[PDB]
């Protein structure tokens, strides 16, 4: 219990809101990123009608696979913003 | 064996048929439950093995 616990300033972090310049900035960055590697994704699923799994990964990519990289980033920012609205709506009702 | 041109066991099967649907009904509910349950069990296992 001694190691895991981080005082009464542990719960404190979980009701704090942040500058919205950095939040709006976080959103745009991720958004823009998924346009760019999603042109890579377009190339990939235009083709992929040809046999040999390894050959697909050299030619149209499958090493640092575009579908995979997009999906992780999309999920990450989606989870943040579910939090950002939850933590905000909590404070609005809770404190007032 | 059995026929309508021989013995049906002298129309026992008619009576039987009348008390058949309660017996069957619960097995048809269970049939539909198996089709779903199965699919979910292997769906999760694919997903489990991949992570």
């Amino acid at each position: 219990k001694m190691l895991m616990n981080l005082h009464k300033e542990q719960w404190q972090s979980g009701l704090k809101m942040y500058d919205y310049e950095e939040k709006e900035e976080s959103n745009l960055a991720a958004t823009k990123s998924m346009v760019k590697i999603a042109e890579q994704y377009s190339k990939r699923i235009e083709e992929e009608k040809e046999l040999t799994e390894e050959e697909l990964k050299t030619r149209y990519v499958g090493r640092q696979d575009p579908k995979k990289h997009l999906s992780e980033t999309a999920d990450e920012t989606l989870e943040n913003n579910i939090v950002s609205v939850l933590t905000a709506g909590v404070n609005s009702v809770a404190i007032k | 064996m059995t026929a309508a041109v021989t013995s049906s066991n002298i129309v026992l099967e008619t009576h039987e048929s009348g008390i058949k649907p309660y017996f069957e009904q619960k097995i048809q509910e269970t049939e539909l439950k198996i089709r779903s349950k199965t699919e979910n069990v292997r769906r999760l296992e694919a997903q489990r093995n991949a992570l």
């Binding site: 959103n27 579908k67 997009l70 999309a74 999920d75 920012t77 989606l78 913003n81 579910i82 609205v85 | -």
Partner: protein
Amino acid sequence: INISNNLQKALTVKTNDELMVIYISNLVRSIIAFDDLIENKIQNKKIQEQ
């Protein structure tokens, strides 16, 4: 919540790619299965032949 709405839809796209890749996979397993059933005849015939 507009940014989230779009992000949830952008994952349906990822899923939709998978569905098609599995319905393609299933299609190949079908072809494989037929090819074996033909091939048992050829091996049955080879024993009578020789």
